Amino acid sequence: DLSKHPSGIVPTLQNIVSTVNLDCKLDLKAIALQARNAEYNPKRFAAVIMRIREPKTTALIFASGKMVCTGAKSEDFSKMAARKYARIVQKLGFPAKFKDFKIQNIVGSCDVKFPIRLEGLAYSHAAFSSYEPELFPGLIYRMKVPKIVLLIFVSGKIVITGAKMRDETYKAFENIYPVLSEFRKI
DNA sequence: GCTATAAAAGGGCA
DNA sequence: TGCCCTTTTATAGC
């Protein structure tokens, strides 16, 4: 679909983090006792860690009724999964609602299929680049428009994070594509 | 398994 | 007051 993706490449979404407000105070101890699919070491982290198989995700349930859903491959799957946790808490006897569901971060990745001269890229876009190969092999490109972070590897493989809307993921990628080509490694 | 990246939630502690 | 922690995921190196 070249009209939307002129590069002819569409980043595949890998992880969605969403949050929602169950709207009631929760008893984390009771929940970890009753819950089966739930983990809870208050000493290590203040939340019950619960997981479901479909959509395969992990939820962090807090005493406040606030919740973080993680691991889904799309926004709808993220909402669905958050909804499943809500019913699990409702059925544990808590009046869980579903308030202010919000997608907080979308992670995508794609492959341009040509290698990149990272040091060159880093040198010419130094105001956005951060590249210490001896520490981490990818170059961190913090794009300003949209405010997105791309991890660029010499392999031609790229990771795009920090999006709240999938179109930001798509645009950051289309924005970086002519740049990747400019620094293709021959 | 562990360098790095985004993001949310909240308890502890300096 | 504010950071670290915990969780997820692609990527690639030690």
The superfamily in CATH containing domain A7-17+104-185 is TATA-Binding Protein (3.30.310.10)
Domain ranges of chain A: 7-17+104-185, 18-103
Residue A166, burial from CB neighbour count under 10 angstroms (0-12, 13-18, 19+): middle
**CATH architecture group of domain A18-103:** 2-Layer Sandwich (3.30)
| A6 CA from C3 C1′ (Å) | 42
Q: Which amino acid is at A60?
A: L
| Biggest CA-to-CA distance, chain A | 63
Protein residues with beta carbon less than 7 Å from any atom of strand B? A 15, 17, 19, 42, 45-47, 60, 62-64, 66, 68, 70, 104-105, 107, 130, 135-138, 140, 142, 149, 151, 159, 161-162
d(CA A11, CA A142): 17
Q: How was this structure determined?
A: X-ray
Handedness of CA A78, A173, A115, A132 (dihedral sign): negative
Q: How many Å apart are CA A33 and CA A27, to the nearest integer?
A: 10
